[PDB]
Amino acid sequence: SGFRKMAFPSGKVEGCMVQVTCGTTTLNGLWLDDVVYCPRHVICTSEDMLNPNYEDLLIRKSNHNFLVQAGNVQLRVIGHSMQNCVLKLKVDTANPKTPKYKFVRIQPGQTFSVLACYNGSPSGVYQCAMRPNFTIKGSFLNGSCGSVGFNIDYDCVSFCYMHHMELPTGVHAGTDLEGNFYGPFVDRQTAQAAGTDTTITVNVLAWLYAAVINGDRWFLNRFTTTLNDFNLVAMKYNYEPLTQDHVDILGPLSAQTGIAVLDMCASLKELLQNGMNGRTILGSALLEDEFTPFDVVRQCSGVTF
Amino acid sequence: SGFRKMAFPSGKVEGCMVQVTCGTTTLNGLWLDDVVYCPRHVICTSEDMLNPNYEDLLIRKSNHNFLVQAGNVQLRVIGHSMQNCVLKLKVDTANPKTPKYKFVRIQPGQTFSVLACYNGSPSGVYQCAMRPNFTIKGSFLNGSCGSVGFNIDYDCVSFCYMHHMELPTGVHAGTDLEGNFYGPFVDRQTAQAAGTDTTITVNVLAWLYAAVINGDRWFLNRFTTTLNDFNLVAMKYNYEPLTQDHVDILGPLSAQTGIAVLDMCASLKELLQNGMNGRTILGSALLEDEFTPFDVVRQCS
Numbered sequence: 001s002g003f004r005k006m007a008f009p010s011g012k013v014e015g016c017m018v019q020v021t022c023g024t025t026t027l028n029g030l031w032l033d034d035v036v037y038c039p040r041h042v043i044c045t046s047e048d049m050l051n052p053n054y055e056d057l058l059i060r061k062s063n064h065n066f067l068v069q070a071g072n073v074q075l076r077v078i079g080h081s082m083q084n085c086v087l088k089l090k091v092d093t094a095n096p097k098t099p100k101y102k103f104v105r106i107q108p109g110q111t112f113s114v115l116a117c118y119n120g121s122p123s124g125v126y127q128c129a130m131r132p133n134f135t136i137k138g139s140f141l142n143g144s145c146g147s148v149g150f151n152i153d154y155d156c157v158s159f160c161y162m163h164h165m166e167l168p169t170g171v172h173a174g175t176d177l178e179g180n181f182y183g184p185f186v187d188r189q190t191a192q193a194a195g196t197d198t199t200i201t202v203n204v205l206a207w208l209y210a211a212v213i214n215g216d217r218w219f220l221n222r223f224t225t226t227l228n229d230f231n232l233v234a235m236k237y238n239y240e241p242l243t244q245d246h247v248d249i250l251g252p253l254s255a256q257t258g259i260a261v262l263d264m265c266a267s268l269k270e271l272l273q274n275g276m277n278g279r280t281i282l283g284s285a286l287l288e289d290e291f292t293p294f295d296v297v298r299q300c301s302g303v304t305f
Numbered sequence: 306s307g308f309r310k311m312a313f314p315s316g317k318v319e320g321c322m323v324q325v326t327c328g329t330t331t332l333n334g335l336w337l338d339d340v341v342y343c344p345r346h347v348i349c350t351s352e353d354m355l356n357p358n359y360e361d362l363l364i365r366k367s368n369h370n371f372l373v374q375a376g377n378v379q380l381r382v383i384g385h386s387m388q389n390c391v392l393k394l395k396v397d398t399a400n401p402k403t404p405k406y407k408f409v410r411i412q413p414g415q416t417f418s419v420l421a422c423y424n425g426s427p428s429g430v431y432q433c434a435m436r437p438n439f440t441i442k443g444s445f446l447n448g449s450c451g452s453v454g455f456n457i458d459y460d461c462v463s464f465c466y467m468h469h470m471e472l473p474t475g476v477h478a479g480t481d482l483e484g485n486f487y488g489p490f491v492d493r494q495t496a497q498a499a500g501t502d503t504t505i506t507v508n509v510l511a512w513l514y515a516a517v518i519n520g521d522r523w524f525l526n527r528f529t530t531t532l533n534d535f536n537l538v539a540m541k542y543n544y545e546p547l548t549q550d551h552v553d554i555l556g557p558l559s560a561q562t563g564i565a566v567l568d569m570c571a572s573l574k575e576l577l578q579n580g581m582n583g584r585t586i587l588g589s590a591l592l593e594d595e596f597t598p599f600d601v602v603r604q605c606s
């Protein structure tokens with residue numbers, strides 16, 4: 001028993017992290033097969049960042065302007081190209097530690113593990129959710145760019161995030177590994193802000209199921225509701241709408257616990273309308289929304305990789 | 306900026322996890338050089354578990370009674386010995402992935418990462434703390450025994466915990482890697498219960514300093530306190546005493562923020578008295594006590 005915020009084991013990703021330096025800027029790259037991926041803003045000076053013409057800045061650069069280090073070993077850059085907001089550096093050596101992998105783009109509400117890195121060296125791992133406002137609530141300092149987010153399935157690493165920027169509220173923005181930003185953000189020193197966020201309803205329900213599985217049941221009640229009625233409450237409390245597909249995804253947890261999704265929605269309704277009355281759920285006084293239904297099933301059943 | 310419950314990257318430990326089977330029992334082992342460390346209860350049957358005589362049970366085992374599997378490879382056991390509550394299985398092949406490592410026994414309040422494993426394969430990694438009552442608040446199912454806790458400050462793995470059992474309140478108990486239990490627990494199916502737990506005061510103070518570093522000031526106040534008056538108040542809320550050692554270790558964070566340690570203690574006093582009144586601190590509506598002063602400096606700097 002027990003329920004913790006759990007990250008994927010990070011070993012398959014640690015073997016891919018390298019250091020990339022261009023000019024006076026150092027950050028991290030991801031070395032897969034014979035390519036290193038990193039944020040394209042590595043090529044900018046502070047003045048360039050105010051209004052970069054990345055196209056034009058890059059033709060100015062040569063292979064030798066990029067210094068790539070895997071541990072203490074330098075990798076020779078033999079080509080370079082840009083894909084959206086990601087720079088691709090072709091190297092002369094294929095990474096012998098390349099795992100089975102693919103590049104995926106995640107949807108808001110989905111979770112992933114972040115391997116925070118500095119100077120090409122992994123320093124910590126934690127679990128995040130892509131917020132509805134397309135930011136993540138990360139923990140990142142100077143030199144963290146190029147750190148990546150990922151999930152694992154059986155033996156396949158799905159890379160979904162590369163870190164680029166911190167917004168003024170202290171939350172974080174980045175791209176998929178094809179260099180497309182999550183959210184309406186740009187890699188430029190110009191005014192930008194996180195939008196108003198919402199709570200990920202289907203994940204709150206998943207966590208309430210995790211709580212019931214772990215013996216926390218005080219918030220259960222005799223009542224049920226309808227998808228229509230609950231979604232009016234959700235809108236009132238800046239919760240994301242709950243869709244029939246969400247209800248179906250939670251089906252396994254409903255059968256396991258005896259609490260239908262709309263039965264649990266009536267519990268959530270009363271928690272939103274009345275608070276927790278001084279009590280806690282799985283050690284929290286807030287409603288937690290960064291566990292997905294799949295996260296709950298995987299942790300409560302011991303899935304391995 | 307930002308502040309998260311951050312574990313160490315697990316790869317150096319993933320490369321050490323193996324599966325150990327004896328009889329019908331399977332759990333995890335830690336393969337370092339030519340030795341596999343695992344909980345000695347792997348040799349027990351159901352009938353044995355109430356009052357096992359581990360010395361008598363082990364003398365009856367042959368090396369070939371232990372099935373050790375590293376991924377798809379069976380490792381050959383060539384010797385075995387018991388150290389306290391850990392079994393050390395000597396194997397014919399040294400682990401080529403053995404990292405730089407040491408064994409450390411930790412004190413209550415210390416934090417570490419746990420790599421939860423089943424059948425020798427990793428499932429996930431999370432952060433824990435040794436509670437004042439010598440339990441940890443883990444996430445562990447059947448088959449998780451032999452999963453380990455560790456820190457990796459610098460490039461050296463410090464192994465500090467091996468998992469053995471779950472207590473009736475749903476918390477967890479285990480040993481250091483020399484096989485000595487944390488707390489008064491024993492690897493026997495006899496009635497046992499954790500003591501009343503308390504809150505790790507020095508860690509709450511560290512986390513309040515983290516909140517100030519990240520730009521929060523709403524909980525600060527114009528007051529200070531003596532150390533003894535703070536402890537008299539804090540203990541009424543089942544907080545651990547704050548010692549001069551703790552005041553000293555908070556010095557660097559005090560210096561960085563410009564808030565004297567006993568000034569922050571007066572903030573904590575007021576928070577215990579008032580609550581948060583609908584506010585949060587670093588995304589929490591409860592006072593968090595599983596970040597140490599060392600952890601705050603690691604993550605914020």
Ligand SMILES: *[C@H](O)[C@H](C[C@@H]1CCNC1=O)NC(=O)[C@@H]1[C@H]2CCC[C@H]2CN1C(=O)[C@@H](NC(=O)OC(C)(C)C)C(C)C
Pocket residue numbers: 027041049140141142143144145146164165166167168172186187188189190191192193306
């Ligand atoms: C890459 O290592 C770095 C990561 C940052 C450093 C602090 N925490 C992080 O997450 N990224 C940057 O330094 C980026 C850089 C590319 C986009 C524009 C450049 C500045 N920047 C930032 O993250 C700053 N944020 C902003 O300037 O935000 C606005 C553009 C909205 C003003 C941050 C360092 C204040």
Ligand SMILES: *[C@H](O)[C@H](C[C@@H]1CCNC1=O)NC(=O)[C@@H]1[C@H]2CCC[C@H]2CN1C(=O)[C@@H](NC(=O)OC(C)(C)C)C(C)C
Pocket residue numbers: 001332346354445446447448449450451469470471472473477491492493494495496497498
């Ligand atoms: C090893 O894989 C396993 C881990 C457990 C399983 C559920 N969650 C865990 O953390 N450990 C055990 O099964 C141990 C075993 C060795 C000590 C005695 C045996 C039972 N046990 C337990 O964890 C049980 N707990 C108790 O029996 O607790 C008392 C000894 C206090 C009665 C648990 C399975 C109920």
Ligand SMILES: [Cl-]
Pocket residue numbers: 283284285286588589590591
């Ligand atoms: Cl909380």
Ligand SMILES: [Cl-]
Pocket residue numbers: 319320321322323375376
């Ligand atoms: Cl292995």
Ligand SMILES: [Cl-]
Pocket residue numbers: 410411412415
């Ligand atoms: Cl310690």
Ligand SMILES: [Cl-]
Pocket residue numbers: 458461463
């Ligand atoms: Cl150390």
Ligand code: NA
Pocket residue numbers: 220221222223224262263264266267
């Ligand atoms: Na109900």
